[PDB]
Design a protein around this ligand. Structure first.
Ligand SMILES: *[C@@H]1O[C@H](CO)[C@@H](O)[C@H](O)[C@H]1NC(C)=O
Ligand SMILES: *[C@@H]1O[C@H](CO)[C@@H](O)[C@H](O)[C@H]1NC(C)=O
Ligand SMILES: *[C@@H]1O[C@H](CO)[C@@H](O)[C@H](O)[C@H]1NC(C)=O
Ligand SMILES: *[C@@H]1O[C@H](CO)[C@@H](O)[C@H](O)[C@H]1NC(C)=O
Ligand SMILES: *[C@@H]1O[C@H](CO)[C@@H](O)[C@H](O)[C@H]1NC(C)=O
Lengths: 450, 125, 136, 109, 124, 451, 126, 451
């Protein structure tokens, strides 16, 4: 004799998708620096995590099909252009530029990277023209027919950044709403996809830094005691390969040029901050990585790659195959100044059957950029006073494969980033969102009194 | 012992029946502002849907309640002892997921008949 | 694109007379007009100038406070009034238009008040005129 | 002050001649607005120089004018029979008034 | 199964066995804010009906009766001529005026029963 | 003896007003193409919606005092304005135009309808100017004094241009009520717009309603069943318009034989203006075709049912519009993105007293500066489209107005006229009504609470 | 007579118990003034549900006056019952037991859970 | 004995809280809907009658200096002001070279050079043409460049002309709390600024509050009964403003004798700029009149109450403002659509030792470009008002700042303030307080549950 019994609040969950709200500390809120990511509007986070260690539970995980990375990609883009509306848009900057080379203290390596352009510009009064001069990099000017023009003139109106807001990434936390829960996997050996013997639940994710970079992961979470390689299809070359370093490597980047900002007064209440003359010597920006440390982490990476490609094959590293400057260079920002570093000196080595050199990398600086691979948008970075020196540590790599024409004796790996969605997969690979289903039915020998 | 939210996910089905109240408290608690508003309203309507469905079955205010409906042997023929000692709620849901919809409908109409039965009995007898 | 003058006659010294000039084929309300008089064996003599709206009037020193000049854009006619004519005042008066156009600066055309014409400081079209004589 | 001009200027056809027309420096050299006119008997005078030194449309290109400090003059190259007539010079005054020159008589041999 | 609102034409007696099906339908950029306001409106409208039912002591029931007398002035028709011939739609218009005054009667009566329940068990 | 009882969930409803959300079909929601009426943010509707017959019920209906058409009228205005925001403003086009009549192979009747206009315009660089030429219709240019012309809208208000990516095609739109509300449908085939409906049914929500814009005619609408019916708020009142729904449709073909071309002009950074270049082939006037055999018998059926309200001995006459603004005296519509203004005087020209392949040709005009909403300050410039266009539509409606100063006469005349946009949409929602559910109810029966 | 909303605020605890229903009705009433006004409706709705589900899990599902099966610790208070109901009001009563409010809510949660399990076993065969 | 825990629902317990109160407009203001600046169309209509409920034997603590209602009022009104300026014209192209000369038609010795005749080149409907226009500008709105003049706002921010179809009349508004919250009103009349209130009455929500903006004085405010109330956060501290309330209001008459005609200038397609055309008749300076007998009598009441805190022997003396910007040293208000900044030195000039048609006149000037909220980057150009303007107001309080400082002098100096604009609105929200309702309560008694 079995009868239907209903229970409310049983611990049963099913996979689903939902909108997750922000969570931030009070560090930026108290300072009131008006960051690009609005922490003041963002909900304050919990004082401490409340993770619960669950036992006898195995849950499936899938970072490649995870919906959390889709929301993060959309939210950051939405937050990026939300801060560009207030400050000025450089719609009248499309004029004819008379540029000439600078030859005062120019080194041969930067012989023609930056020019000296002069042009007419508007003022508050709509019947006056002022003749001003500014220094523009070669990557931002093209010969119209000397006469030069900005690359964005035939693309769209080109908006500049707000000087007050800062581009320094800060940690953010994602929290599920009421009735939903987030599960975290604490298995170190857990690769991209598979069951997790140990699963824990949290109300808010750990601090995530929205660092944007290509071919290199900077300021990210590290692995534990080994180097983890994740790929939705290791055999397929079209799918990128993600690497996580157990021990970070330090990189030093600097801009030796000492340029002076010149606030050109245009229009009523609008300002255009141009680049003035550089005092002292002029040299290229460069980044250093220790050869002893970099060669050490390559040895750890190649050992992991042997497991998925045989312990007898030859692993070879090559530079970028080709494309534009955005995808063939290590793009990042450093104290408000954007960089495009040439990383051909790193992936140049071969491994078969197996003293601070400080490898230097030439780098370039661009003023007009397309942040999120879109067309018709700008973010013109104003120049920064003084010399820029930022120190960062690399916490991963993104690699691609090629060839494999039935010759299973040599493997070539080259850097490449399809999009920034894969950049944040290395931080959201251990988190998934599920919805609770309290209602449940079970059989029990019990009745209702009449 | 206290285990927090979803603490007894992998524990025994009978053991989890003594910690049903902890989950019930956790059902409900410019870009950021509009995003939060959608979640709050979605949580409110989700909670009311379960409460309203539980109310029609005659067990609105009871966490544990059983109706006067026989348990079909087709859905599951396993012993009562085996279910409540060597099974979890996560595995139990998968075994009766297909038949869950059928059970829900029966309890809805059964309660209304029970309500009508007691109404005419006290009128004169 | 054509001007006709009328009102000539013979009057005694100290009398008064009025001459009428008419404009057609072009905008009378945008350009100013002059007044010139000539005699046989004598050179041209300028009398007065009036702006498009008649804001100010300019008169020659030799005939200062002698000839009164007014215009009526509504009637599309020009008026020339003189009082107490002298024996030497006889001449052949001509109704003459002063050419004008917008000022071109910074790439735009700059007009005057109520869409006026800035004078280009040269005369293009001249009237046929009327001959007047004074006898006692 | 009326402008001073020569009584008469004579020149055979095909030659170059110069006509002098001078007044006050403030009136002539100040406002830079100088004009020249040509007249025929029985007909109203016609403008021959659009600007101080630029000719208008519909006139022969043989005409030419120039100014040198206080002095200004008009030069005609390749004199012809039709050039016979009366010529006058007009310019603005300091007080924005119009002054007519004395006039010069041209004789064609 | 007459579906939602399928007993609108049936008599009051016949419609008393289909209250369950109609209870579910209570709750279920231009289009964004327009739908958000409507969704919130349904939630609060359903709660208003439940709150009034809550203070009557039988919130978790579909059919309920209270120990308050009926007034003959409201309707002189017997039970035969109400539960067998007429319709719920017609019934609402007949006693629409009396609805407001009746709601107060149950509100005070239920609170009276609570005092009796607490005092009765405490003494015994 | 008797005690009150409370029932939760009785079938009782009352009149109320509420906002209804959008809904789109699966086929229209997977087009993956932008349009004026946003296919997104509209919740998909399940196939084969359930229609529940309501037996033994009578419900009052009224289409004139309906708030659904008012909300639909406001929604479409908001939808139209939302799609014109991302588009580029055409404010630099307020410049002097030197236009000349184009004459290569122009036919006699269309002579003077097209102007070859050349004007200075800016470029991407702010310090340079470019000379371009374009063709403008005579309805879009006005005189100032190789003559000098000017855009008509410059002295009223500047406005943007229609974005080529979006389309004006009227995809079906379902207005669906939220939870706690119901929509009642009148299945009666003789519903004259007012009075009880013996056959009343409830549905989840309405079917596809095409947001078509038209004047003096209703196109691509719903047809009556087996008969032609006349709808009017007050027959005696001549001011009120009359709505007619055809039982059978008549085919109308509207074509533009001119082979216009698109010549893109870049006016600034990221903004371009689409103009009209040289036209290949001969130049012809746009026109529409309606079969005379079907139109004549359609009026014969219409005049018969219309004679019921006037007596069978009443003389009924048809006449063209009384004149006035172009947007109200002409049959205005769109044909694949091109807006037409047709002359319908050739249709409503006949008389009736006590009662094969030939067609009727209606001349039509083309205009680009468009308001369409009887508003000031919000116009739109429709860019030209490449190639010739032909569209085939149905005529499933008609709007007429009555007149006459005689106090008593045996002759009555009717003229077409577009009163308001609500008339075009109220002809589709006359069968629907929104009601609010009232689950609470009280009734007396023998039931005493246990004590 | 009628005292209105919060009418018995200054009245005694016992007298205020007879007018608890009037306050219950006011819990859920029914661009700058737009979305801003919308949060008022949501906040009121969610607050009512929190106070309802918390009371529901104590076994007091729909009763304005309801007693639980837990003892009253003498440490919390030692005042005469006559003064509590006939002299003291609800305003200052909150202050005395404000610190111990959180713990008592937990005891009611477990007490009701014990009742549910015991009821099923009792009626199974007895 | 063995008393058990019993839970009660709906108990009257409350504490302080914060919430977003909503508006409540009157029935009359909800029907005209003539595009009010405060967007009262969206505001919900108010209750037909007040529903004040008196609470007996209740003691509540109030604090008017830390009340969050004024912060919400201050935050809202700025947003309402900004929202009303978007859909109307922006005067971006007016920043041009101006040639301004003095007007000497019928000027007065007081208005020697207060008005300038400015002419400038402004854009016409066509982008390729510019027409010379002239207008009259006040001296306060023009700054010399080196003659040559330019607008003051040109080098800081370009802003919007005040919209001509909107009105600035301060209609009353009601702030009301949502469900679960209550508003407590202190009916005590001796309540200074803090303390228990013997008579506290809960109300549906606040009464009508007129959003009047003024400095150094309180206009059209609330009146105290049979007493003059002086309120300050800290009387000892001299940096804290002092608020005064008048039991008997004193009337002030303000007018602009000049008669000027508005002239509309077209600055572009669909944009119009309204400028002062010409002044008909004599030109005279604006002024305000206050009766000497009433003002002197009112000042006697103020010193008597003010002498209580500082000692009955202390000598009270008054003086004008200590200097600074024009927005703080003068009395700022509006009369119709024109804004005044008036020199009130003739009022605060007296010395008290403590043992009928004089019509004290306050000549003053008028400004057209105003930064009302003391924020840089958001100004407004108020168009001129046709004809003369006259209005009477009720002076119901003052904002005085004490500047004694030295402890070696017995006499004390009081000067008008007005630095913060929250004081004007704080003087009307001091009576109200916002609390939240907690229906859950537990009490011990004798009750048991059946097993
Ligand atoms: C491959 O060789 C390495 C050498 O260290 C060894 O550790 C590993 O077990 C080998 N794997 C297989 C599959 O033979
Ligand atoms: C309909 O027409 C007939 C003529 O056959 C006429 O006798 C009759 O009166 C008409 N109907 C009405 C209502 O007048
Ligand atoms: C509550 O009661 C228990 C036993 O009756 C006692 O041990 C405990 O100390 C009491 N709580 C407090 C806070 O005293
Ligand atoms: C114009 O006014 C200014 C100041 O008001 C004065 O300095 C100047 O002398 C005045 N000029 C004339 C011509 O009145
Ligand atoms: C101060 O003088 C006033 C005069 O009316 C008197 O009422 C008050 O009591 C005096 N106070 C003291 C402290 O002397």
């Amino acid at each position: 004799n079995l009868w239907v019994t209903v229970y409310y609040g049983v611990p049963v969950w099913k996979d689903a998708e939902t909108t997750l709200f922000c969570a931030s500390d009070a560090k930026a809120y108290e300072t009131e620096k008006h960051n690009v990511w609005a922490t003041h509007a963002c909900v304050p986070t919990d004082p401490n995590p409340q993770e619960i260690h669950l036992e006898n539970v195995t849950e499936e995980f899938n970072m490649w099909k995870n919906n959390m990375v889709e929301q993060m990609h959309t939210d950051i883009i939405s937050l990026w252009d939300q801060s560009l509306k207030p400050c000025v848009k450089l719609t009248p900057l499309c004029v004819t530029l008379q540029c000439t080379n600078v030859t005062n203290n120019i080194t041969d390596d930067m012989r023609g990277e930056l020019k000296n352009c002069s042009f007419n510009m508007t003022t508050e009064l709509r019947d006056k023209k002022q003749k001003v001069y500014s220094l523009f990099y070669r990557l931002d000017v093209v010969q119209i027919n000397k006469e030069y023009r900005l690359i964005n003139c035939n693309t769209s109106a080109c908006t500049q950044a707000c000087p007050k807001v800062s581009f320094e990434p800060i940690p953010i936390h994602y929290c599920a709403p009421a009735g939903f829960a987030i599960l975290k996997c604490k298995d170190k050996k857990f690769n991209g996809t598979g069951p997790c013997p140990s699963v824990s639940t949290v109300q808010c994710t750990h601090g995530i830094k929205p660092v944007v970079s290509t071919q290199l992961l900077l300021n990210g979470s590290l692995a534990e005691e080994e180097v983890m390689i994740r790929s939705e299809n290791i055999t397929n070359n079209a799918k990128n390969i993600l690497v996580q370093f157990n021990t970070p490597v330090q990189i030093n980047c600097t801009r030796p040029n000492n340029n002076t900002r010149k606030s050109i007064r245009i229009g009523p209440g609008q300002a255009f901050y141009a680049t003035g003359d550089i005092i002292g010597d002029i040299r290229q920006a460069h980044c250093n990585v220790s050869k002893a440390t970099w060669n050490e982490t390559l040895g750890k990476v190649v050992k992991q790659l042997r497991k998925h490609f045989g312990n007898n094959t030859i692993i070879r590293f090559a530079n970028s195959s080709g494309g534009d400057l955005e995808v063939t260079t290590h793009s990042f920002n450093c104290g408000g100044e954007f960089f495009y570093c040439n990383t051909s000196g790193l992936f140049n080595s071969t491994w078969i059957s197996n003293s601070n050199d400080s490898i230097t990398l030439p780098c370039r600086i661009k003023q007009i950029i397309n942040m999120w691979q879109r067309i018709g948008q700008c973010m013109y970075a104003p120049p920064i006073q003084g010399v820029i020196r930022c120190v960062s540590n690399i916490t991963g790599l993104i690699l691609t494969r090629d060839g494999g024409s039935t010759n299973s004796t040599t493997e070539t790996f080259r850097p490449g980033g399809g999009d920034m969605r894969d950049n944040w997969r290395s931080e959201l690979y251990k988190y998934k969102v599920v919805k609770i289903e309290p209602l449940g039915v079970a059989p029990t020998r019990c009745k209702r009194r009449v | 012992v206290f285990l927090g939210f979803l603490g007894a996910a992998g524990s025994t089905m009978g053991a989890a029946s003594m910690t049903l109240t902890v989950q019930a408290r956790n059902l409900l608690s410019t870009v950021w502002g509009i995003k939060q508003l959608q979640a709050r309203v979605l949580a409110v309507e989700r909670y009311l849907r379960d409460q309203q469905l539980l109310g029609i079955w005659g067990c609105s205010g009871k966490l544990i309640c059983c109706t006067n409906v026989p348990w079909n042997s087709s859905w599951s023929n396993r012993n009562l002892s085996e279910i409540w000692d060597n099974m979890t709620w996560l595995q139990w849901d998968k075994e009766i997921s297909n038949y869950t919809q059928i059970i829900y409908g029966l309890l809805e109409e059964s309660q209304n008949q029970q309500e009508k039965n007691e109404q005419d009995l006290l009128a004169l007898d | 694109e054509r001007l006709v003058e009328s009102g000539g006659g013979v009057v005694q010294p100290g009398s008064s007379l009025r001459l009428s000039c008419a404009a057609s084929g072009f905008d009378f309300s945008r350009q100013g007009m002059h007044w010139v008089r000539q005699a046989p064996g004598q050179g041209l003599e300028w009398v007065a100038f009036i702006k498009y709206d008649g804001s100010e009037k300019y008169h020659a020193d030799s005939v200062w406070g002698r000839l009164s000049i007014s215009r009526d854009n509504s009637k599309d006619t020009l008026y020339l009034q003189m009082n107490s004519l002298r024996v030497e005042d006889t001449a052949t008066y001509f109704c003459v238009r002063e050419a004008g156009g917008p000022d071109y600066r910074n790439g735009y055309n700059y007009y005057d008040f109520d869409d006026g014409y800035y004078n280009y400081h040269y005369m293009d079209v001249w009237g046929k005129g009327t001959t007047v004589t004074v006898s006692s | 002050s009326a402008l001073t001009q020569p009584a008469s200027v004579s020149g055979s056809p095909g030659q170059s001649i110069t006509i002098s027309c001078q007044g006050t420096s403030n009136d002539v050299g100040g406002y830079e607005s100088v004009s020249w006119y040509q007249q025929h008997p029985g007909k109203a005078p016609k403008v021959v120089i659009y600007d101080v030194s630029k000719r208008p449309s519909g006139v022969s290109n043989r005409f030419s004018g120039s100014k040198s400090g206080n002095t200004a003059s008009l030069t005609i190259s390749g004199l012809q029979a039709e050039d016979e007539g009366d010529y006058y010079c007009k310019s603005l005054t300091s007080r924005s008034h119009r002054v007519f020159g004395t006039g010069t008589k041209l004789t064609v041999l």
